[PDB]
Amino acid sequence: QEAVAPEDSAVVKLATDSFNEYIQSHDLVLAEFFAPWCGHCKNMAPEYVKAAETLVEKNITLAQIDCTENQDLCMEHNIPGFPSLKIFKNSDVNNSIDYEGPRTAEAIVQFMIKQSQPAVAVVADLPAYLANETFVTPVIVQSGKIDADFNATFYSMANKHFNDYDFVSAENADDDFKLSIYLPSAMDEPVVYNGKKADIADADVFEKWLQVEALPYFGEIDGSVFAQYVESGLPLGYLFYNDEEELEEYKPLFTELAKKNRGLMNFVSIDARKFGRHAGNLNMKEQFPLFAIHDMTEDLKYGLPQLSEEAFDELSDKIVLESKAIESLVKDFLKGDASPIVKSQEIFENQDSSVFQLVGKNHDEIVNDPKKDVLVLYYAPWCGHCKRLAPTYQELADTYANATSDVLIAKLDHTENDVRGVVIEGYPTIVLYPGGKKSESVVYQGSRSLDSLFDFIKENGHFDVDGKALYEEAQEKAAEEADADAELAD
Amino acid sequence: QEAVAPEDSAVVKLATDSFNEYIQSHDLVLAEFFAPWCGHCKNMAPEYVKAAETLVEKNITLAQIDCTENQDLCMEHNIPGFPSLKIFKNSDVNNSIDYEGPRTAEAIVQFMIKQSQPAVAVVADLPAYLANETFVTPVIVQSGKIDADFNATFYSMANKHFNDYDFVSAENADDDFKLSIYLPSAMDEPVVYNGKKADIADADVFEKWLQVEALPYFGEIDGSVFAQYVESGLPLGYLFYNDEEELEEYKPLFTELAKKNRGLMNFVSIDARKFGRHAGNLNMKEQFPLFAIHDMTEDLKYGLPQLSEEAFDELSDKIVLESKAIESLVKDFLKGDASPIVKSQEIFENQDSSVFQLVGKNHDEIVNDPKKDVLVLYYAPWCGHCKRLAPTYQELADTYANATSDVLIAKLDHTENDVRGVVIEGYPTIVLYPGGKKSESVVYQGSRSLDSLFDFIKENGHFDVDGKALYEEAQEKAAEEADADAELAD
């Protein structure tokens, strides 16, 4: 029988076909990269088997990898010598602790309780657990009587999700089903979970629901939490605080909102002392306390109509957001009604160069008209790549200025300027806009060369406007104009 | 040439060998699961190529999967029909949006800028970016001149890490190297990064360093952040607050600590209003403001020696932790000096049953002595599995009581009782302890049956004590004792 763990043995010889798909799925794999002629790799094989049939009840993994035939997999894994007992934990293909401890069953049986991962916490009285075990972590919990599509979804998710929650799987069987989520703020009030189950027994379904409900109705907005506030899709309404009397005068109201509109939009507070400077980033003046919504999906900010500047300095009395106003904003937004507020800077009373500095207000207009074939540099004043560009962009624009004006070549600063139309997250985004005879979603993708745009602006151009030919014709005309020949010779 | 993207083409025909290892490594894969005889899958192949050689500059993935020969991979992926243009984003093997948009190069070239992932943010003036772009997210940034082991580590990590930071890769080339981390609290002070580089150009190396330095020296302790506060290994020192005068009287001091001891131990605050109930969980009375350390690695809590109870109620004046005391604790701990504090309840003046209820104070003692072979149930009063046990445990203990006392059978409540010795995270942990003639790390693993322990306690027992034989002998003796026969017959 040599060194095989045969078909009858309680082990699955993982092959090269998919070591990694098997590893990273399983919560805690125990490998054995081995060779057959290695006496030791035979001369402890009954022990691997004896720590096999017995060790499946804490579903332990036995994994013989015949590095003879499964050779190319020994490459993607830095094997020292045979037998190799590098055993993987959370189960990525990095953590490979080459365990040099005993090669017995009754020995290493114990080492499978080296990192016991008790994710699920079965209880008799939750009251106790909940109160004996205080924690900053919200906890998922189920009681009642557990379905099949559940023990290995609830235990499953948890198993690979302590980076997130506490996972009690309690079951006072004399009880109908249940799936609460005890949030660290108000534990009195857990989660009314509506029971469509067989579909909410997988990810991203089971998942998205935690991603929704595991967020404290009205918590603070850490850098940390702000991740999963955006892993949401729900527009969050930011409120700014100066004092905590200011926080806690408001803190009930927003909880009560977030409760009703739970699934539609989110809510957070935000110390204004450390983040007044965000205010504008939500198109909003630094007057506090400041409530504002942000449609994260399409980049649209809605503020509670902030008070005027020519009464800002003149205002010793403080600032107060009447609840009545707070709601009416929220409802509006969701009705598809509230006013979003672009940052049109003041419109440039015609100044220097052939590159038109554009604004939100005009942009909507100028980009359209069929006269002319306007190109647009959507930009911000800081990035490296968007400034090593305006030099070309000028000697680009200048070439078209002189020649039959027509094709406008313009730039628009996305700092202090929202645009309703098309955009990439990052700058310098470049776009050409023919007009109302044909569409304007004609995004520039390529190099920076004067050359490459001159292509584009004719190639993908309504008028078919050979700017290069100009840049030929032009440089010739400026080669002669100066030199007078007759000055002197030789 | 039929429908092959040949060796000369700008595409890599991913095979079944490892689709997934290729997918989940790459930030944004664009698949084409195809068959050769599918006219359309030939009749748009030059377009895949024409959107190949040109589209590698935003390293786009072209992936032909010949579902003829790579068939078993079509199973692990729910293919509709040929050609299939299910293109994967963040790149797990779930998100498979079967894109039915155009089958041209100059068309779908654009759709590779559908989810542009500008992770890196190149800038000319960081000052602007930093200030124009306010955010709750700390930002990693490098200037100077970037090494090879860096663009595709910095860009790399980021690429799959917006769930964490903002990643500016700026480079005012006229400058020596640099890797700061601008933390959202004090941006004035970024990160003095010490320059051993070629090693800090990988994970978990580059990683662990963010995992260290990206945490605000002295932030609050959200449920969220508490994850990565434990993904650390650094003991964090918790301080509790009642007021913010109480917070901000202390808030400078702890920052200054966390700065010096940056790598050794961490620091956080914690509203006592919502979490007084944790206090005990750090072996600590609910007197506030309360500073305490927690050695997360070995479960050891160190408090600033909280004031007495018989002067608790008598104390109208408030509570104050003198800085001088705060430091001296920290130093001590790190010297390997400070006192950790077990929760020994009061020692049970001999009461009811054959199961000895143990305490921290005694436990150290009783577990040891060679007389006798003590078994120990390490437990908590709530879990399901640890109470469906004491019934056996009694009719276990009783069997040994009557018979030559010797082997003690005991239980120890881990709620209101720390144990210095061996433990599993979860209960009911069971252990037998012979003594000073042989070691005591003899952990019970198995069923609950009276049977299984009776094995254990002899099998792995110093005295070799057949309890089963008793449980034979015993039940016989209680079969006779009662029935008097002569009462009546028939």
- Per-residue 3-state assignment (H helix, E strand, C coil) for B229-276: HHCCCCCEEEEEECCHHHHHHHHHHHHHHHHHCCCCCEEEEEECCCCC
Residues in A touching B133 (Cβ below 8 Å): 281
- Domain B340-490: give its CATH code: 3.40.30.10
Query: Does A220 contact B216 at a Cβ distance shorter than 8 Å?
Result: no
Q: Which residues of A touch B425 (CB under 8 A)?
A: 116, 118
For residue A261, the 8-state DSSP code is T
To one decimal, the resolution in angstroms is: 3.7
Instruction: List, in order, residues 6 or more apart from A181 with CB less than 8 Å away.
Output: A138, A139, A140, A141, A190, A191, A193, A210, A213, A214
Element (H, E) at B62: strand B61-66
For residues A359 and A418, give the distance between their C-alpha atoms in angstroms, rounded to a whole number.
Answer: 9
Bridge pairing between strands B139-142 and B180-182? antiparallel
Q: What is the token pair recorded at B360?
A: 């921290």
Tell me which residue of B378, B375, B380, B382 sits closest to B406, measured CA to CA: B375
DSSP B280: G
Fold of A1-117: Glutaredoxin (3.40.30)
Return the residue matching tokens 């905590």: A244
> In this structure, are residues A361 and A344 in contact, taking their beta carbons and an 8 Å threshold?
yes
Chain A segment 32-91 residues within 8 A of B by beta carbon are none
Supply the DSSP symbol for A207: H
Q: What are phi and psi of A142, to 5 degrees?
A: -130, 145
**Sign of the C-alpha dihedral computed for residues B324, B330, B334 and B340 taken in this order:** positive
Please count the helices (runs of H) and the strands (runs of E) in chain A. Answer: 16, 17
Distance CA B410, CA B366 (A): 10
CA proximity to B99, closest of B59, B57, B44: B44
Shortest CB distance from B223 goes to which of A133, A137, A426? Answer: A137
Whether residue B439 lies within 8 A of chain A, CB to CB, comes out as no
CA–CA separation, B96 and B92 (whole Å): 9
Distances (CA, A) of A337 to A254, A299, A343: 21, 16, 19
Chain A CB contacts of B277 under 8 Å are 131, 134
CA distances for B98 relative to B85, B95, B231, angstroms: 6, 9, 37
The closest CB to that of A113, out of B94, B277, B445, belongs to B445
Every domain of chain A with CATH number 3.40.30.10 lies at: 1-117, 118-216, 217-339, 340-490
Q: Do B121 and A223 touch (CB under 8 A)?
A: no
What is the Cα–Cα distance from A378 to A224, expressed in whole angstroms?
Answer: 31
CA pair distance A379, B286, nearest whole angstrom:
55
Q: Please indicate if any CB of chain B lies within 8 Å of the CB of A109.
A: yes
Q: Does B175 touch chain A (CB under 8 A)?
A: no
| Cα distance between residue B118 and residue B179, in whole Å | 19
Contact A329, A284 (CB under 8 A): no
CB contact under 8 A, B443 and A122: no
A477: contact with B, CB 8 A cutoff: no
Residues in A closer than 8 angstroms to B51, CB to CB, are none
In this structure, how many other beta carbons lie within 10 angstroms of the beta carbon of residue B311? Answer: 8
Are residues A275 and B136, on separate chains, in Cβ contact within 8 Å? Answer: yes
Measured between CB atoms, does B415 come within 8 Å of chain A?
yes
Strands A300-303 and A291-295, sheet pairing: antiparallel
Which positions in chain B touch A132 (Cβ < 8 Å)?
Answer: 380, 382, 415
For residue A212, what are the contacts with CB-CB under 8 A and spacing of at least 6?
Answer: A232, A234, A262, A263
Active-site residue set of A = 38, 41, 383, 386
Q: Which residues pair with A301 in a beta bridge?
A: A294
* CB–CB contact B171 A383 (8 Å): no
Q: Give the DSSP per-residue string, B110-147.
A: HHTTSS----B---S-HHHHHHHS--SS-EEEE-S---
Which helix (H) or strand (E) segment holds residue B72: the answer is helix B72-75
B57, B117, B122, B136: best mutation site toward chain A, by most A Cβ within 10 Å?
B136
| Chain B residues touching residue A122 (CB < 8 angstroms) | 383-385
Report how far residue B160's alpha carbon sits from residue B157's, in angstroms, rounded to the nearest whole number.
6
Alpha-carbon distance A218 to A268, whole Å? 5
In angstroms, the CA A180 to CA A183 distance is 9
- Determine contact, residues A373/A403, Cβ cutoff 8 Å: no
Given phi > 0 = left and psi -120 to 50 = alpha, else beta, which region is B91? left
| Structural tokens at position A170 | 């309690």
For residue A228, the chain B residues in CB contact (below 8 A) are: 224
**Distance, in angstroms, between B467 CA and closest chain A CA?**
23
Of B122, B226, B227, nearest to A385 by CB-CB distance is B122
- Tell me whether residues A382 and B216 touch, CB distance under 8 A: no
Vertex A112 angle, CA A111 and A118, to 5°: 125
Q: In what order do the strands lie in the sheet with B300-303?
A: B219-220, B266-271, B236-241, B291-295, B300-303
Contact with chain B for residue A15, Cβ under 8 A:
no
Of B80, B83, B32, B36, nearest to B60 by C-alpha is B32
- Helix A390-402 to helix A467-480 angle, to the nearest 10 degrees? 80
**How far apart, in Å, do the first and last CA atoms of chain A sit?**
102
Chain B closest CA to A94's CA: distance in Å? 9
Cβ-defined contact of B383 to A274 (cutoff 8 Å): no
Q: How far apart are CA A173 and CA A122, in angstroms?
A: 12
Residue B102 at interface with chain A, using a CB cutoff of 8 Å: no
Instruction: Say if A274 is an interface residue toward chain B (CB within 8 Å).
Output: yes
Chain B nearest-CA distance from A278, in A, is 5
Alpha carbon distance A433, A374 (integer Å):
5
Smallest CA-to-CA distance from A373 within A294, A454, A315, A450 is with A454
On whether any CB of chain B is under 8 Å from the CB of A406, the answer is no
Please answer whether residues B178 and A391 qualify as being in contact, where contact means their C-beta atoms are separated by less than 8 angstroms.
no
Contact (CB<8Å) A118/B203? no
Query: How buried is B114 (Cβ within 10 angstroms: 0-12 exposed, 13-18 middle, 19+ buried)?
Result: middle
For residue A425, give how far its alpha carbon lies from the nearest alpha carbon of chain B (Å): 7
How many angstroms separate the CA atoms of A139 and A164, rounded?
9
Catalogue the long-range contacts made by B276-281 (C-beta closer than 8 Å, 24 or more residues apart). B277/A131, B277/A134, B278/A134, B278/A135, B278/A136, B278/B238, B279/A134, B279/B240, B280/A134, B281/A133, B281/A134, B281/A135
DSSP string, B167-190: EEE---SSS----EEE-SS-SSS-
Sheet containing strand A139-142, edge to edge, reads A166-169, A139-142, A180-182
B383: closest CA of chain A, how far (Å): 4
Q: What is the DSSP letter of A332?
A: H
Q: How many helices, marked H, and strands, marked E, lie in chain B?
A: 16, 17
Tell me the three state secondary structure of residue A108. helix
Nearest CA distance, A375 vs chain B (angstrom) = 18
- The CATH class for the domain spanning B118-216 reads alpha beta
Q: Which residues of B are catalytic?
A: 38, 41, 383, 386
What values do phi and psi take at B240, rounded to 5? -105, 140
Would you call A381 an interface residue with chain B, using a CB distance cutoff of 8 Å?
yes
**Residue B350 touches chain A, beta carbons under 8 Å:** no
Inter-CA distances, B428 with A72, A465, B377, Å: 44, 81, 7
Q: Is B428 on the interface with A (CB under 8 A)?
A: no
CA distance A350 to chain B (A): 26
Based on the number of CB atoms within 10 Å of its own CB, is B204 exposed (0-12), middle (13-18) or buried (19 or more)? exposed
Instruction: Spell out which residues of chain B touch residue A222, defining contact as CB-CB under 8 Å.
Output: 136, 219-220, 222, 224-225
- As a whole number of angstroms, the distance between CA B183 and CA B167 comes to 12
CA distance B99 to A467: 37
Residue A297 forms contact with B (CB below 8 Å): no
HSE-CB of B437 using CA atoms within 13 angstroms = 9
Residues of B within 8 A of A134 (CB-CB) are 275, 277-281
Q: Does B483 touch chain A (CB under 8 A)?
A: no
Distance CA B57, CA A352 (A): 36
The values of phi and psi at residue B312, to 5°, are -80, -65
CB–CB of B195/A284 below 8 Å? no
B488: number of Cβ within 10 Å:
6
Considering only the top CATH level, what class is B217-339? alpha beta
Q: Does B224 touch chain A (CB under 8 A)?
A: yes
Q: Are A116 and B221 a contacting pair at CB < 8 A? A: no
Experiment used for this model? X-ray
- A51 chain-B contacts, CB cut-off 8 A: none
**What is the gyration radius of the CA atoms in chain B, in angstroms?**
33
The CA-atom distances, in angstroms, between A390 and each of A386, A393, B364, B423 are: 7, 4, 77, 67
**A370 in B contact zone (CB under 8 Å):** no
For residue B31, list its beta bridge partners: B63
